[PDB]
Fold this protein.
Amino acid sequence: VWRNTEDEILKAAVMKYGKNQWSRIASLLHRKSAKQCKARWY
Amino acid sequence: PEEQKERKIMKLLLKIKNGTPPMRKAALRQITDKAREFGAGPLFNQILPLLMSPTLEDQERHLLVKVIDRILYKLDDLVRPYVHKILVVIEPLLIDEDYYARVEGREIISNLAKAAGLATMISTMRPDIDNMDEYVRNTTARAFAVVASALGIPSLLPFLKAVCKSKKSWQARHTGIKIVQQIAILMGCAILPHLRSLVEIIEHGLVDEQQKVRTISALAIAALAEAATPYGIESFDSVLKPLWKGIRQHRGKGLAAFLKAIGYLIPLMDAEYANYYTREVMLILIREFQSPDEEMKKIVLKVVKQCCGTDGVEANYIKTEILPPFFKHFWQHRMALDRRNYRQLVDTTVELANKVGAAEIISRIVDDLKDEAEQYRKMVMETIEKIMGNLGAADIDHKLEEQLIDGILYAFQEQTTEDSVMLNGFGTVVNALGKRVKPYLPQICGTVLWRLNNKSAKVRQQAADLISRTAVVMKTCQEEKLMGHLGVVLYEYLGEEYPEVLGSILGALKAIVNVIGMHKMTPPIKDLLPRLTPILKNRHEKVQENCIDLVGRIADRGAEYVSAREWMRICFELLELLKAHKKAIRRATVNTFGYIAKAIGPHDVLATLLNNLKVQERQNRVCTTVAIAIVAETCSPFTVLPALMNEYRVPELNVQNGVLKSLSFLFEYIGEMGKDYIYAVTPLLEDALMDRDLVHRQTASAVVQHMSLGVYGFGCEDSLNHLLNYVWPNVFETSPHVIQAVMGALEGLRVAIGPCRMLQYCLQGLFHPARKVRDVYWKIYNSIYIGSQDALIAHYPRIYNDDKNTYIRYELDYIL
Amino acid sequence: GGKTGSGGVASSSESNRDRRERLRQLALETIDINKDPYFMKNHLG
Amino acid sequence: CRRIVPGQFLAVDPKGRAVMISAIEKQKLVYILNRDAAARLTISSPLEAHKANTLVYHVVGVDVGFENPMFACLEMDYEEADNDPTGEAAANTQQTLTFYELDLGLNHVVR
Amino acid sequence: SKKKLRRMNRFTVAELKQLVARPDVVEMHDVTAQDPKLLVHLKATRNSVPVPRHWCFKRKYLQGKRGIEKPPFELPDFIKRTGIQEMREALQEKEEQKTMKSKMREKVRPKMGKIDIDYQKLHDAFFKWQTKPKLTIHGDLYYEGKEFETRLKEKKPGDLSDELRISLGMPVGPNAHKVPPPWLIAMQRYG
Amino acid sequence: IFCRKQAGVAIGRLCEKCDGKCVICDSYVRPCTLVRICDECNYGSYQGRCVICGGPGVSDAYYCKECTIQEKDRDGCPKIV
Amino acid sequence: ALGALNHLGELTTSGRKMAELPVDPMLSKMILASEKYSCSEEILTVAAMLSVNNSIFYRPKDKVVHADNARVNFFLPGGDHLVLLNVYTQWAESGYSSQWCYENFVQFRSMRRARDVREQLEGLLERVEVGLSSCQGDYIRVRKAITAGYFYHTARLTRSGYRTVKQQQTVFIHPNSSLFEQQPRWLLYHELVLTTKEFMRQVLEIESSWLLEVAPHYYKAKEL
Amino acid sequence: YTIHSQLEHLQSKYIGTGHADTTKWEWLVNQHRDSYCSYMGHFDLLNYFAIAENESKARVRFNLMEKMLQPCGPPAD
RNA sequence: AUGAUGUCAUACUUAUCCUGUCCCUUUUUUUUCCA
Ligand SMILES: [Mg+2]
Ligand SMILES: [Zn+2]
Ligand SMILES: [Zn+2]
Ligand SMILES: [Zn+2]
């Protein structure tokens, strides 16, 4: 699932990169993939 | 009632059972003085059922036998009326498959009969030697052995004379005879003071009508021989003849044990007896060489081993007399099929080889290399291997050696199990053929190569192995075409992808390069090693083990048929062998980093090691820190110390700790040549002993330990004093690793700095209010005391004497 | 179609080290864009 | 020169069969000596006689004839004299001329 | 309660200080110790070294050093002189700029022997210019903040500093002798 | 856990996994003196084993020179039983 | 120790009642404990199970997974004994159905003979003076009556494995235990065998506190 | 705490060690005995005392081993 | 101004592991008013 730390790393990544570059945001996250990133954000 | 009370207060066996060792001291001492008054009258009836209680434990037994022995020493007389009871309730323990039941019953009965009233024993256990039950006769007989241990045979020997001269019962004559054999088992050497008295005891029954007594007396002869090593028939001649005649005029169980005894005396014998006796018994043996029976086979073959293994059994004698029926009836499939016969047939046949040579035995077991029960030819090579390995192959003539080499080839092809059996057989056989093997190297290799071509991995791997065995003789017979063959053809197979074969190929190449040096290798290592570098990425323990072995050899000795750039790439590949799951690989990797630092200079390899320290995950960080230590040890430490120290400034944890751990290993490895770099290193350890983290201080402490043990005796004690100032505060600590490395630093520092300095550090906190500090200082002072308790005699303070004690030492201040 | 003159592909340990470092720069960026006076990076990282 | 590690006293058996090494408290060992086949001397592992709280004023081998060799030590026992707050047991304690004995057959030292 | 009767034996700190022959030692918890006459004779022996500060404290050893920021370790001169640090700085900046692809390209085609630094420079640092650092003699345990504690007990008047001279108006160096400080002026004026 | 029942004249041995380290100091270097064990941890199925692994006795347990400088090698059979 | 004997070795009321009662005492002590714990029916059915267990669940190779499944269904929290309890409960619930056990991988032989032994136990129950009671779903009483019977048959956690409470000899858990992976700290068993390694069967997790509730004369606190 | 079984075995192993409750009397008496065992062992302090008093080596070591029994007063209580 | 309490994941230590593990033979115990 998802933990405060990862959720905030996500928040930071997205707010920087923009809301359609899911693959790099996924790359920032250890053991998280772009499907899950996109779902969690939306 | 005072008796029930005395038992009440007597159950402080609870004080001894439960409790502090203080409890043990109070009760043990009080009872060891109260033993007479409290008596064993009540004790013994309280005492026997706990000693027999099913789960009184090891130390419960230990303590209660402590009790029984010391209270029986105390009460030599005040244990008197309970003797038969103790006796019969403990008796089965000496004859008991618990060695320690034997031991403990033995010891307490020693002390029991020892402080006992003497005649009592005889009185109770005369009428039981005549008894009807062999059970009770054996129990009381081995008891009597223990009682002779307790007292001594002399006091008893005429009553033995009685129990053995009885004309009422054969039961009792058998009983006395086994008492004899039993002491002969127990006291061993201790019999020669009698040495014939027991022989006299026994002369009556080897002629007796009851086979039981007759044959247990034969075994008594056996046991007495055993404890009565080579000192021969200056005692035993008095019975040699009934043995002699019953051997033939008997059949069965008597044949067994009587043969056993006579073969136990056959060592102790002499020519004019050990020629007639052996020569006579040999015809018995020839009729028994067809005996189906198992313990028969055991006894007769053991006999034969000693018997036809003396100096008075002629070479000719055996070769024409024993061998034909021996080989005929034991070299059938049955014996190798058997679990016992395999090994024991081995034993005696290797001994007969030791006797009469190889050019007949080898010839008699050649073609058993081509039989059916693979177990069989397995056995025959087991033997042959043992044989020629102990003896040498001097007398093996032409045709013999031929059929041998050929049966060898067969065994090895025919192989159907993964065993070192046939490998070792081959290795030994050519190891002994030495230079005899020249003309079959086409044959031997051609075989091995056709196997190397096979479809299934296993046989391929086998042929690689066999090459790695015979590798040395391959050359030593000057195999230009042939050892050249194996060189280039294995350079071919270096492309395999079955790890199990690739590893063995690497092994065989290594075992060729060992014999033939680098600069005449058939593939020049100038092309070998470039081929090897892409294999170091094979992520498999066996191929990785053997590859790093081969590259380590080359980088050690070859090292110059390769270019700096090659060595650099190979460095970069080694950097990730440091994560193999097997530790042999990792130690080999570190060694080769050392060799490469020798061949190329140290500086580039050291740069590539620091960048690895930056990795995480610890077990490859720790192994690169070992490698740094090794590079520094080979190429002198001044080359690497500045770079290490300077890297101590990159602000990351794993790397500052890598630097500290590397200096740890470095001072361990160099040792007494730390008297140079101790000054350079101190301000970095004081830096890291003023906090940076737990692990920071744990590691700086380890470094202090090894510096101190290196610089023992070279005067750099001011520097270790300075670092004591910084290590000693960590004394109050909790984490196990941290406080443990601290304590280690203080033992090292104790030898290197002396025990005054450390007793002074430990003075004031011995008697402190607190208890955490009292305990740490008494832990230290204990370790300072154990080692070097004898210096301190001149280091203790001056501790004034109050009123009713004297505490000053006037001995030490006599003037003179 | 790959290309000639290239190394391999970074191994998981190096990929991990640089994932870490990139994460750290992500952190420095966010604490920059959020202007924090309550922050320190210590001599141990 | 410790106190409980052997070496201060050492005795032999008059015939040359065993040696005993002994400290001034708690420790004494015994070594057995046999010529080897080539008569070049051997020495097997040592025996034990660890007995706490006991001095030794001397140890010496007693001359027996091919029996078990055995040794006469003096002794003392400071034990009680340090359990008595009165100093009585300081006085009233007696040397105990004692013999330990081998048992080469059973390979131990018996009091 | 028996501990409480020994607690009535638990004498006064004045009891101690008056009894004892050397009263400097006597401290707070000294009295709850099972043998204070010993404890104090020991603590008043020569050359012995007292327990650390921090057995009382609730904070562990240097969790109090936790707060601050700290500057990296400073090499020995005779090792700076040999000019290693600049080599390493340069290599650092290089490899922080270079990118992953180029990193692996250099893994497969190394820049063999980029740099050099000669021996006899090293061997002379370590064997010809190595020198005794500043060491502290027997007893002076390091405790937290000790390096922060400035220094005291130089009641001597001649003790002057160069920043002292500058920010007081007096001279620094060989003229710290021939410079009477502005306080020796009123020493001459009114004592 | 230690045997420590006192020393003797019987050498100890190492399995090949355990090959190379000292018995306690856990070193890999400069071994000086041979190891000796007690009769009790000498007998029987325990003949020629690895004091550490329990594996077969093949290579000889030795004593790191530090352990001999501090005479931690004068205590006897240190077998972790 | 179980309380059938006085301190001199003769018969107590508890002691006689168990000899007349068919089957062994440990069980008998547990059945008497149902009297105190008002878990009569449940302790009864448990006894009925331990009478015959050795053949309960058919474990064929050719249907291993569906079998392990129709087994893993009933697996209750507390241990194998209440497992058996629910299993019997559900079988009789089905109306003593044979196809029930056929569907659910249970040996009908074991089940029905166990039912018979419980019914004749009930036919003994009037003589042994037991009131027909339910635990009302309170398996605490159940585990406690199990203890009051089988306190002897206990082990504790050791960091070197599961080891006895008394002799501290070393045991292991049967693979097929409903607690086999649960691996409880305070263990009760029903078998003590040493197959290829030491084993114990029909095991349950207990409180060491019930042990000072039941046998402070045999189990003292300091030993727990 | 099996460490402690071994450690009070160590207390049983080395006469003269300590623990956090050890009394001034046990401490100083153990150091006094050790002092005696070494005056005997070292062949030369024996000459020092033999010569300091006007005794002779047998006299010296006999005194010493007599004193070894209650060297520092009678016991504590 | 640093308490213990924690079902906190992360970081970290021991040249600490990757080689120290697994499924039962046989069979037996008397019983009670029906409604
Ligand atoms: Mg392109
Ligand atoms: Zn060691
Ligand atoms: Zn042992
Ligand atoms: Zn090993």
